[PDB]
Symmetry: D2
Subunit: 347 residues, 4 copies
């Protein structure tokens, strides 16, 4: 009889762990039961975003203090970029004593020449199986959202790779984020059976954006070399007030999937609603026939636009700004769209 408990904690700063410390001090959260922490941090959400790594170090110090080496098994998904009115926050996932289930998993360092290729797809497919097992889930149809934290390439990482005779899938550092999210997304797809294995090859990745998962949510970062996996789903072997529902946004302003999730969860939009969504600029250069400018803008990187825009669209529906919106939906939902999940209690 395990219990899922999800806690949304405000932050004033990437290094501001004061509020999580407080939930531990008041015994609202028990350090021993922390599975994973998601975050929105104030960085640019792209390559040179050190708010991500900054938060990670700060969370590491605090969690090790309370659980020493067992902190290292906690999944830290720090997703940068809080544009528009999107409010920075931590999402703490704690395990307690059918309802919401949580499973986690890790991977070894990822060879720079494996990134964006079938190497990454595999190595991630496995972790998703392990973590969805640890969640106590056997039916893929009972999975609702799979978060992945993946690596990326810098110019210096690229030249290091070439120095030992290897080639990387790109030398463009920002493209390398897309490849990593995409390859990871297909790995998630593979493990949930949304894609056939012989449908995949290096040439397919970030090319056939017709292959996609309705549940992949992948976030790239400069601060890790392997992967973090967190599976959220519904299970018979879990109990508690919290359930999760999900849907696919067809484009950047498609908010009906969220209204549908709330219905399924039997909850109404309010400050209490937890929202996880992927935002992506559509590669057509259009939304519902109308041209957009995100792919042609040299000042503000495309994912910064997408986040700002869908965060606004979603906040207009759910009524508050503490929502988790993540940019770049390579093979995560249809092109121009992305998965969205809601976590609420029944009324």
């Amino acid at each position: 009889m395990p219990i899922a408990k999800v806690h949304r904690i405000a932050t004033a700063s990437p290094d501001d762990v004061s509020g999580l410390a407080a939930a531990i001090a008041t015994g609202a959260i028990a350090p021993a039961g922390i599975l994973a922490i998601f975050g929105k941090t104030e960085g640019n959400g792209c390559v040179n975003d050190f708010s991500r790594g900054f938060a990670v170090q700060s969370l590491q110090m605090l969690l090790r203090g309370h659980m020493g080496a067992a902190a290292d098994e906690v999944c830290l998904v720090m997703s940068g970029g809080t544009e528009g009115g999107m409010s920075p926050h931590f999402l703490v996932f704690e395990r307690a004593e059918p309802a919401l289930a949580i499973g986690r998993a890790h991977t070894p360092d990822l060879p720079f020449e494996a990134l964006g290729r079938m190497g990454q797809v595999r190595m991630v497919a496995q972790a998703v199986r392990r973590a969805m097992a640890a969640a106590g889930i056997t039916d893929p149809e009972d999975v609702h959202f799979v978060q992945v934290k993946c690596p990326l390439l810098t110019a210096m990482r690229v030249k290091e790779a070439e120095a030992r005779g290897a080639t990387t899938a790109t030398s463009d550092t920002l493209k390398s984020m897309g490849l990593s999210r995409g390859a990871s997304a297909l790995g998630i797809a593979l493990a949930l059976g949304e894609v056939a294995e012989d449908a995949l090859s290096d040439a397919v990745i970030c090319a056939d954006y017709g292959l996609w998962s309705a549940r992949a949510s992948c976030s790239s970062g400069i601060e890790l070399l392997g992967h973090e996996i967190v599976v959220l789903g519904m299970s018979e072997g879990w109990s508690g007030p919290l359930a999760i529902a999900h849907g696919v946004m067809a484009d950047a302003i498609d908010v009906t999937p969220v209204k549908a999730a709330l219905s399924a969860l039997g909850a109404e939009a309010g400050e209490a609603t937890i929202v996880l969504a992927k935002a992506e600029p559509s590669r057509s250069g259009r939304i519902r026939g109308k041209r957009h400018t995100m792919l042609d803008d040299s000042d503000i990187s495309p994912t910064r636009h997408a986040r700002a825009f869908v965060a606004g669209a979603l906040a207009g529906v759910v009524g508050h700004t503490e929502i988790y919106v993540s940019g770049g939906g390579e093979h995560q939902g249809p092109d121009g769209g992305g998965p969205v999940a809601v976590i609420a209690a029944r009324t």
Copy 2:
């Protein structure tokens, strides 16, 4: 009896006037009756945004071709900044002649604005006078029949500040991005003053962009490097106009308050669709919070605050109205409450 005709035209480029050319060529739009053109252009919407001036020049060239010197009387409001999915377009406002109350349109211009008047009572009075003129031209005497007042106002660059100081004057600021806020703010109070939403002996230099408790529910101001004076366009309802188009408006309490638009669409007897026309002001709240939750728009040295506000509010409204060809403008100094802004809708009745 005159008819308002409002035309939304796509553009691929700030200088793409091809769709306006075609509308004129097919007689969909008669150049003689063009009162004003609004635009969202692909620039950054701040100080060094030349997509605005580029569109103006392009529009001026086309219109001089058809109207000659009368082209100069057309109000050109080019508001830059199309962040998020917001889609670049022109809004052409035409007056035509036809046979209940309908959309009315009035325009007015002003002389150049002395750099030392910007952000001060000089600007306020100048715009106020112009707004009264445009009101009259719309055939509107009751301010409650005014629904939206668009103003294009100037700003300060380093060069302009030093020009002013060179002749013994001071400007209200030397921060060029701040000058855009002051200029929008002074213009907004001018609109307020003209509509009677604010009392004249309540206003002074010291109040402007200081007492954000003074605001208009109808002001919409957009600053730009490309003009030295103001363009004023008043939109309202009038008994002396007819046609299918009406206008409704409301005030967003904050950046995610989408209820004013749904209420506006009800008043108009219309439902959200590709055809809905939306004009809205988006503003980062100076409290640094939205509904208790902190935001980072005022603290970001990479992306200028209005750039955030626009992308964010455009997304909220687009989510409601179902398309991205909407006019959203950043910085709501004295335009609605702090953190909010006016929103207006223009639709035809279907119920």
Copy 3:
């Protein structure tokens, strides 16, 4: 016997042609003899830079006024991006008639470039042919007498890529900022091919923006959203020209290699001063290092790499030549070694 006249004109705005107007009005510049105009405009110098197109339109309007349809034969190279202290200006190249070897100028144009040719041998051959034509027009047959070849080339936007795919074609990229590099690169190889710095059977699609060991010491390419073809301007020395102006050039080994300019000024018998004219390419090095030390230009999602390179190299050169009215252009694909770029100086002899 023809004379090169080079005029450096300040601008307050991309659309500020006032100084060029005055130079024409005072007969300092005769419109008939205007061969090309270079510009540094206040845009970001990347994909969505409309200061370039804005200056072009403005220049086209003024020149059509004086020359009519012959205006269209003037090469307009507007290079955006004036970071750091770099000062926005126009460089007007005029041919005049006078009575040793001196500055020679040649221009040439090309037809529109098929989107599926950009970054591929199509573009390379197109530019190569044009550079040969401009060479001839300059009255230059010896390539060693060519000192600098400026090329304005197109780029790809999302819309253009989807247009190409719609008719069964592929483009060499879908990354619009990458398309600028490919276009500069293909053009540079075209210049190289035309000057014999590279062999034709060394070139192929697979080489372009891949083998940065193939490069020209004289190529200078600038990409822009505002044209579909190319503008070519060849600068060199010729026996068949006379006048005070000569040109010298060199290759910066990296971003802080200022020795080529000092050597160039020696060759020209001139010393650094307000009058020195400088044209240079700046490029972030793909090794990610300068002289062993890492740089962050390739890793920055806020500021695009060429934006860095320009500001940085402009500072180095400005520190040498003593003023900030210099023409610095970013992205040196096949223009000099990786991390370097050509620099040319134009001066009159005083020793």
Copy 4:
């Protein structure tokens, strides 16, 4: 007979302390003798720059490891913004057993309503006296460079201030950096006798840019609430190979002061040369008559331009890119200019 030793350490990352660890491991640097560390970090060098605070935490952990609570007396000046080719690095100042002298000092937290006012000017003037004493310097004419790390204001910090009835000198967060650097600069000026005390008042600060120090170098940051002071100068009571010279750059491309410093130091430009310089966009909007665009640019903040530009100008002279250039020279050198210092050995 104290010895000044200055060590320039490369970094791949704001949190990359591997190279400083190595100098400690090889005994090239002794943790006990570390006085202050200067840094160039990859952030935007402005308000939301977390690479600064990120480095600080990383340096804190490493230094506390070796010297515990005595690490806290080490001055950490992390200056963000590495535009152009400027290469991120640490400058470690260690004390060993007339030549280069080093003195340090601290200040308490700074009240948000004191920032940019005579409060800050004073509180900093004192620390500069204390630190220049600890350096063993009595003649102000023997001081060559005074580094200050100062605080700034965020929107949330502003509303916190107003909540208790106080007003701040600004509500513009980026302006608050200028006020803090300026007020600190005048404080340094005050202590070196470059300015008279009754010449100062709130109204003068960041207004009369005719009052300035030839030695102030002030750097603002979101990650501290008080001030860090480091004085560098020439002393009889110090010995060793290292000397320091300084000069004032009249504008952004005035490189002759550095050639002059090298002459005084009897060294020639080379990879070995250490450079400290302040860069500022001139408020005239011109450099030597020619208009510039730094004050009118809404995409890239003015100090980001200035750094890129003078870093390039200086690197062209000194031949390498590992130089410390800091943006914004309010009362630090003339308007449009800034102090520059060089540290070399005699040949």
